[PDB]
Design an enzyme around this catalytic site. Structure first.
Site, PDB file in Angstrom:
ATOM      1  N   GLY A   1       0.785  -1.229   0.000  1.00  0.00           N
ATOM      2  CA  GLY A   1       0.000   0.000   0.000  1.00  0.00           C
ATOM      3  C   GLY A   1       0.816   1.277   0.000  1.00  0.00           C
TER       4      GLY A   1
ATOM      5  N   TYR B   1      -9.668  -0.699  -2.340  1.00  0.00           N
ATOM      6  CA  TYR B   1     -10.592  -0.456  -1.236  1.00  0.00           C
ATOM      7  C   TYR B   1     -12.017  -0.618  -1.743  1.00  0.00           C
ATOM      8  CZ  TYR B   1      -6.712   1.533   1.508  1.00  0.00           C
ATOM      9  OH  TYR B   1      -5.549   1.728   2.206  1.00  0.00           O
TER      10      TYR B   1
ATOM     11  N   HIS C   1      -6.013  11.338   9.411  1.00  0.00           N
ATOM     12  CA  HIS C   1      -4.641  10.902   9.357  1.00  0.00           C
ATOM     13  C   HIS C   1      -3.860  11.611   8.275  1.00  0.00           C
ATOM     14  CE1 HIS C   1      -6.339   8.672   5.962  1.00  0.00           C
ATOM     15  NE2 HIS C   1      -5.103   8.595   5.514  1.00  0.00           N
TER      16      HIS C   1
ATOM     17  N   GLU D   1      -0.346  10.676   5.668  1.00  0.00           N
ATOM     18  CA  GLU D   1       0.227   9.452   5.122  1.00  0.00           C
ATOM     19  C   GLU D   1       1.403   8.974   5.916  1.00  0.00           C
ATOM     20  OE1 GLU D   1      -1.389   7.809   2.329  1.00  0.00           O
ATOM     21  OE2 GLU D   1      -2.804   9.139   3.364  1.00  0.00           O
TER      22      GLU D   1
ATOM     23  N   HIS E   1      -6.552  14.148   6.419  1.00  0.00           N
ATOM     24  CA  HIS E   1      -7.777  13.878   5.671  1.00  0.00           C
ATOM     25  C   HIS E   1      -8.592  12.788   6.334  1.00  0.00           C
ATOM     26  CE1 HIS E   1      -4.423  11.791   3.808  1.00  0.00           C
ATOM     27  NE2 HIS E   1      -5.247  10.777   3.569  1.00  0.00           N
TER      28      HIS E   1
ATOM     29  N   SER F   1      -5.182   3.000  -4.413  1.00  0.00           N
ATOM     30  CA  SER F   1      -4.265   4.019  -3.910  1.00  0.00           C
ATOM     31  C   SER F   1      -2.861   3.528  -3.648  1.00  0.00           C
ATOM     32  CB  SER F   1      -4.813   4.724  -2.670  1.00  0.00           C
ATOM     33  OG  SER F   1      -5.298   3.823  -1.697  1.00  0.00           O
TER      34      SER F   1
END
Ligand SMILES: Nc1nc(-c2nccc3c(=O)[nH]cnc23)cs1
Ligand SMILES: [Zn+2]
Ligand SMILES: [Zn+2]
Length: 342
Positions: free
Chosen positions: A160, A167, A178, A180, A266, A278
């Site tokens: 990931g 997803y 959170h 990244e 976000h 993603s």
């Protein structure tokens, strides 16, 4: 004023990914922490999605939410492996389908009112890509950014992070506030289905949201320096408004890309049955964020910054390794690659 921006590249502009990220930053898109990119109509990553019903979701998660007054904690319960078919059956069933709504503001109201009721299931963290092998523009599997250095020099891979994730969403499935891992950039493509709504806090107000979460969850903040990295904390837009945390909202529709910028907080939710892909990526601007990221201390993802400092900041390596790099990040500055547009 640090508002989420939308871009519509031409097929020629769309062909070079890294150059386009530098372009959107020269336009100030990084300031919101989130930007939307609508691809050219002629571009499609896959001809059809009717041939993925037998795809295995190995670890689906039942999302249990506890809390009150716009502050919640999400507990993920691992369920038995299921197919995209079994998942869509539950997602589009009367028990888990989207309620009737006239405008987004009404669906957003229902989400924050019912988040703790009828726990939905998220087909999250599925290792894979839905891109066809010969798709050369914005291929999440192969972006070709400087993040590639980790795999190039050592061969190590982080699921990931430098590999893609799928997803499979359903109504009310969500992602907590959170940033990244390593405060990296992220790219999200909604392949098909119902929309995905996003909340975003500008990177320049990110320390404010952290301070607020520390005040609301003192036990959590005492046990871990960066508890938000656990991706368990849900804070409603009304609470953010009350405590004067600046934020923006956006809805991502099937066929659009969402880009998150370094230190961009976000959160969001799925409107109903859908599928997103993603990965993370980097630019030269990320180097400083990665060197300064506050990681989970209780316990997670950690990338060695040495190769990045060695290659792109050789002059500062001796200073940085000795704990003498007292660099202060200016969140308003675009990436150095944006110089051509400025
Ligand atoms: N670094 C990470 N980012 C995420 C994340 N970030 C943005 C959107 C999503 C999402 O829609 N579903 C699940 N996870 C999402 C999860 S772990
Ligand atoms: Zn994310
Ligand atoms: Zn922790």
């Amino acid at each position: 004023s640090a508002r989420i921006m939308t871009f519509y590249p031409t097929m020629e502009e769309f062909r070079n990914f890294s150059r386009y990220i530098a372009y959107i930053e020269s336009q100030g898109a990084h300031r919101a922490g989130l930007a939307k990119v609508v691809p050219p109509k002629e571009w499609k990553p896959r001809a059809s999605y009717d041939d993925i019903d037998d795809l295995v979701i190995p670890a689906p998660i039942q999302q249990l939410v506890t809390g009150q007054s716009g502050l919640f904690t999400q507990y993920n319960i691992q369920k038995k492996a299921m197919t995209v078919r079994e998942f869509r059956k539950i997602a589009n069933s009367d028990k888990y389908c989207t309620p009737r709504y006239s405008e987004f503001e009404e669906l957003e109201r229902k989400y924050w009112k019912n988040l703790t009721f009828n726990p939905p299931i998220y087909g999250a963290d599925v290792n894979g890509t839905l891109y066809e092998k010969h798709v050369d523009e914005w291929n999440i599997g192969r972006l070709r950014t400087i993040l590639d250095l980790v795999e190039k020099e050592s061969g190590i891979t982080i699921e990931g992070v430098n590999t893609p994730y799928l997803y499979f969403g359903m109504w009310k499935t969500s992602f907590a506030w959170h940033t990244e891992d390593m405060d990296l950039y992220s790219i999200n493509y909604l392949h098909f289905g119902e929309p995905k709504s996003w909340y975003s806090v500008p990177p320049e107000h990110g320390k404010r949201l952290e301070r607020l979460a520390k005040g609301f969850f003192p036990g959590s903040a005492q046990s871990c320096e960066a508890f938000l990295r656990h991706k368990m904390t849900l804070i409603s837009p009304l609470m953010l408004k009350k405590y004067g945390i600046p934020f923006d909202k956006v809805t991502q529709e099937a066929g659009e890309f969402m880009i998150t910028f370094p230190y961009g907080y976000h959160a969001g939710f799925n409107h109903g049955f859908n599928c997103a892909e993603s990965t993370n990526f980097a630019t030269r601007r990320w180097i400083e964020y990665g060197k300064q990221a506050v990681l989970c201390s209780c316990r997670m993802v950690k990338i060695s910054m040495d190769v990045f400092v060695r290659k792109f900041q050789p002059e500062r390596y001796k200073l940085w390794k000795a704990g003498k790099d007292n660099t202060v990040i200016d969140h308003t500055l675009p990436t150095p690659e944006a110089a051509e547009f400025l």
